[PDB]
Amino acid sequence: LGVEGEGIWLALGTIGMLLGMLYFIADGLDVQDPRQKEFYVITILIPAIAAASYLSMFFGFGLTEVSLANGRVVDVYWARYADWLFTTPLLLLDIGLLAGASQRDIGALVGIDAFMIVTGLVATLTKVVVARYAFWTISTISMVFLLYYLVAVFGEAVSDADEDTRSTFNALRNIILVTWAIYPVAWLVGTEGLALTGLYGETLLFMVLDLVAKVGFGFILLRSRAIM
Amino acid sequence: LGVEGEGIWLALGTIGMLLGMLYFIADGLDVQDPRQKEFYVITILIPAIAAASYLSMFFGFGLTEVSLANGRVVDVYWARYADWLFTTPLLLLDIGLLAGASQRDIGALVGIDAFMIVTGLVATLTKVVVARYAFWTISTISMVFLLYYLVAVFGEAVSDADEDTRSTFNALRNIILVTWAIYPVAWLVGTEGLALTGLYGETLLFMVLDLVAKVGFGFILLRSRAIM
Amino acid sequence: LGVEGEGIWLALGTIGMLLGMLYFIADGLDVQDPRQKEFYVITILIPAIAAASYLSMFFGFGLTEVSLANGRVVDVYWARYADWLFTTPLLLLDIGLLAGASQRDIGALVGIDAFMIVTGLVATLTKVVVARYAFWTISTISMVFLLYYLVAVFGEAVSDADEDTRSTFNALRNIILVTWAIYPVAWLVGTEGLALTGLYGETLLFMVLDLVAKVGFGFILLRSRAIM
C-alpha cells in the first residue's frame, strides 16, 4: 500500500483516529454543562480532521513528488500540514480553556503555532536544499518559543485553579512537551531531511506521534474530574 | 461561454449576487444601531464574495480539468469551494447572531461547516473513484449533523426571544434546511458524481441554489423587524 | 540574485524585517501589563511573518511564471499575498486595539481586508487580460472602502480617548493611508499590470512599502506613551 508500503500506517492511523473520535462522541452524549461540552466539541473535531486527512493520504490525495535542486526526489505527504494547521490550534485552545488562559494568551500561542506549521510546510516544499534546513530551523525555533510559553504563560494561568485542574493541566502539558518536540526530529531523520529512514519508517513515526498527541491527549482530558 | 455553454449561468450568477449586494448596501445607508449594522455588514460581504467568485469562474480562473482513475475527465470549478469556505460560516454567523446563540455554539457549527466544505473539496479533486464517493459521504454526514445542530442548538437559543425574532429565525432556518440539503444531491447528479447531467445543468443548479441561499436569505433577514 | 537581479531587495527586505522583529522583542522584554504585552505580540508577529515570506521569495519558493493571453510572461511572486493575508489583518487589529474599536468594527475591517487581498491575488494570477484589470479594480474599490472606514469608524472609536492615544492613532492612520494607497499603483506600474517598470523596480518599491508599513508602523506604535 502507498509508494513503499507506508499506506499500512495511513490506514491504521485512519482507523485509530476514527475509533478515538467515536469513543469521545459516545462519552459526551449526556453532557449538559456548556463548558464541559465545549471540551467535547473541540476534542471530537481534532481526531475527525485527522481521520479525514489520514484517509485522504491513504487514497493518494495530499501526496506530491518533489524533485530537489539535488536531483533527490522526495515523496511529500503535504496533507499532514493541512491537518496540523487546524488541529494544533485546536489542541492549544483545549489546554488553554483548561488552564483558564485569557483570549489574548491563547491567541498569542495560536499565532506562533500557525507560524510554526507554515514555515514547516515551506521547509518541506522548497527545492533549494539550504532553504529546507533554514526553514526547518525557523520552524523549530518557533516551537521552542511555543513550548516555553505553554509552560510559562498557561502554567501561570492555571496556578490559581483547583488541584484536579492543575494536575490534569500538568499531564496534558507533558504530553505536548514530549510528543510535539519529536516532530522536528522525525522530519530531520525522515526523507524530508537527512533520510536516515525512508518513507515507511517516517510515516510510522508520525502515525504514532499523531495518535498520542490527538487521541491520547483527548482521552486524558475528557476523563478528568477537572472538566466535569 | 465556458467549456460547454455554462458561462451564461456564471454571468447571471455574478449579476444576481452583485444586484443583491447593491440592494443591501442601499438599504443599510441610514443604519445607526450597532447590532443592526453588524447584520448588514455580514450580509453584504456574503454576496460580495460570491459575486467575485462567480466572476473569476466566468473568466476561467478557478477551473481545472481532473482526469479520474476512470479515464473520465471532469471540469472542476474549484473556486466554488473557496467561496463557500467563507460564505457558509458567515451565513451561520448571521443566523446565530439572530438566534442569540453563544460564541461557543456558533463556533461549534462553524467548525463542522468548515469540515463539510473541505471534505467536499477532497471529494471533488481526488482521482480515485471510491475516494470521491467516500469523501462525498463524509461531507454529507457532517451536513446532516450541522443541520441538526442548527435546528436544535440555535432553535433552543432563540426560544426565549420575541415573536418576531422566532418567526424570522424559522424562516431563515427553513431556507437553509431546504437549500443546503440539495447541494450534495447536486454534486451526486452532476459531472463530479454520477454525471446524470452535464456541466451546463450542474452549473445552472448551483447558480439557483447559491442565489436563494445568499440573496434570498439576505433579503428575508434584512427586511425583518427582528433586526430593527 | 533572482530572475532579473531583484534578489537583492528580497534579501534586504528579509534583513530589515528581521532587525525590526529583534528590536521589538528586545524592547518588550520587561513588559508586564497585559494590554501593552498584546501590542508587542501582534507587532513582533507581523515582521516575523514578513521576514519569513521575504526569505522564502529570496530562495525562489513562492515564485511562478504566468503566461497571459497576451503572450506576455509575468514572474509573479505569490508568497507576498500569503504574507499580506495575515499581516494586513494583524495591522488592522493593532490599530483597532489602540483606537478602542469594538470587536464588531475590527472584524468588519478585517473582512473587507481579506476581500481586498484575495481579489488582488486573482488579479495577479489570472491569464485573461481584462480579468487582471477587473480584479485590480475590484480590489482597489474595496481598499478605498477600507481606508474610509479606518478613518471614520476607528476615528470615531478613538475620539473619547486621551490626547496621547488620539495623537498616536492619527500618526498610525496616516502611515496606513499613505503607504497602503500606493500598493495598487505599484501593481499597475509594475510587471503585473502595465509593465512601466520591470520586476527589479517593482520588487524595490514593495520592499520599501512593506518596511514602512510594518517596521515603521511598529516603531511608532511601540514607542508611544499611549500603550504604556
Residue numbers in the entry:
A (entry chain A), B (entry chain B), C (entry chain C): 11 to 238
Task: Kindly provide excerpts from the paper associated with this entry.
In this work, HwBR proteins were crystallized using the in meso method, and the proteins packed into parallel trimeric and antiparallel dimeric crystals diffracted to 1.85 and 2.58 Å, respectively. The structures of the monomers were almost identical and consisted of seven transmembrane α-helices, two β-strands in the BC loops, and a prosthetic group all-trans retinal bound to Lys224 via a Schiff base. The values of root mean square deviation (r.m.s.d.) between monomers of the antiparallel dimer and of the trimer are ∼0.36 Å. The trimeric structure showed that lipids (1-monooleoyl-rac-glycerol, MPG) surrounded each monomer to induce the formation of a self-assembled trimeric structure. We used 30% glycerol as the cryoprotectant when harvesting the crystals. The presence of glycerol improved the resolution from 4 to 1.85 Å. In the structure, one glycerol molecule was found to be bound with chain B. In both structures of HwBR solved in this study, two guanidinium nitrogen atoms of Arg82 located at the BC loop formed hydrogen bonds with the carboxyl group of the main chain of Thr201 in the FG loop in the extracellular region. The location of the Arg82–Thr201 hydrogen-bonding network might shield the retinal-binding pocket from the outside proton equilibrium and protect the protonation condition of both the interior channel and the retinal-binding pocket.
The light-driven proton pumps feature a seven-transmembrane α-helical region with a lysine-bound retinal that serves as a chromophore responsive to light. In this study, wild-type crystal structure of a BR with optical stability under wide pH range from a square halophilic archaeon, Haloquadratum walsbyi (HwBR), was solved in two crystal forms. HwBR could not be classified into any existing subgroup of archaeal BR proteins based on the protein sequence phylogenetic tree, and it showed unique absorption spectral stability when exposed to low pH values. In summary, we characterized the overall important structural and photochemical features in HwBR and in comparison with other known BRs. This study demonstrated how the Arg82–Thr201 hydrogen-bonding network cap gives HwBR a stable optical property in a wide pH range.
